[PDB]
Amino acid sequence: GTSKLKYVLQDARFFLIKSNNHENVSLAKAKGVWSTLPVNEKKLNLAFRSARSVILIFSVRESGKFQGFARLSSESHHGGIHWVLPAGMSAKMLGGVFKIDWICRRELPFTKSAHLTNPWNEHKPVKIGRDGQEIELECGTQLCLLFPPDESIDLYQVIHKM
Ligand SMILES: CNc1nc(Cl)nc2c1ncn2Cc1ccccc1
């Protein structure tokens, strides 16, 4: 069913994550971590304190799809990842590491979200946006509800993290 999912998305904040390659998203799905540039890292830490759930919605550039969505379980932390680094990039830029809990690891093609526009990006289709773009509540909720159900995930523990 979808009731626990709707509860998790209740009053959540949503951010679009644009990865340059699939390898990093695969690594994030295996290890439950994400890293972004310093500008987006600061925005996500602020949002984590402000909302009962912060949702990251992933899209690999040129894939034409979203690859799933996850909930932040922590602010970024350093010390204690073999990211594939794009042109330029640098390991120090990706140094902050967030822990995340996947809510859906299934794909959604951009063709299925063409009816959703994001007020925080000039009402462009939600697939359009740079890495870190915030997605307004209603559009974010409807976008997440479009993904195929991921029956391998139990949201009971996620609800407890809240
Ligand atoms: C592990 N995190 C990441 N991995 C990859 Cl391959 N691309 C990312 C990324 N975070 C943001 N981008 C997009 C971008 C923005 C600016 C210059 C190069 C690439």
Protein residue whose Cα sits closest to atom 10 of ligand 1? 36
Rounded Cα distance, 95 and 55, in Å:
20
Kindly report the CATH class assigned to 1-162. Answer: alpha beta
Backbone angles phi, psi at 108, to 5 degrees: -135, 115
The DSSP 8-state label assigned to residue 125 in this structure reads E
Cα dist. 10→5, 69, 144, 154, 159 in Å?
9, 15, 12, 17, 11
Q: How far apart are CA 135 and CA 14, in angstroms?
A: 5
Asked if residue 35 belongs to a known ligand binding site, the reply is yes
Residue 86 CA to ligand 1 center (angstroms) comes to 7
Rounded CA gap, 158 and 99, in Å?
A: 13
CA 109 to chain centre: 15
Contact 36 CB / ligand 1 (< 6 Å): yes
- Is 124 known as a binding-site position? no
Cβ density class 60-87: b for 16+ within 10 Å, e for less: beebebbbbbbbbbebbeeeeeebeeee
Ligand 1, atom 3: closest residue by C-alpha: 19
Judge contact between 145 and 1, C-beta under 8 A: no
- Burial letters for 14-25: b for 16+ Cβ neighbours within 10 Å, e otherwise? bbbbbbbbeebb
Task: Give the resolution to one decimal, in Å.
Answer: 1.4
Residue 135, C-beta contacts closer than 8 angstroms, at least 6 positions apart? 14, 15, 16, 57, 118, 120, 126, 129, 143
Q: Which amino acid type is present at position 68? A: G
Q: Is the Cβ atom of 94 under 6 angstroms away from ligand 1?
A: yes
Place of tokens 């809240």: 162
- Contacts of 8-11 spanning 24+ positions with Cβ under 8 A: 8/53, 8/71, 8/103, 8/155, 8/158, 8/159, 8/162, 9/53, 9/55, 9/140, 9/141, 9/144, 9/145, 10/52, 10/53, 11/51, 11/52, 11/53, 11/137
154 residue type, one letter: D
Which sequence spans correspond to the domains of the chain? 1-162
Cross-strand pairs, 124 = 118
CA atoms within 13 A of residue 126's CA, in its CB half-sphere: 32
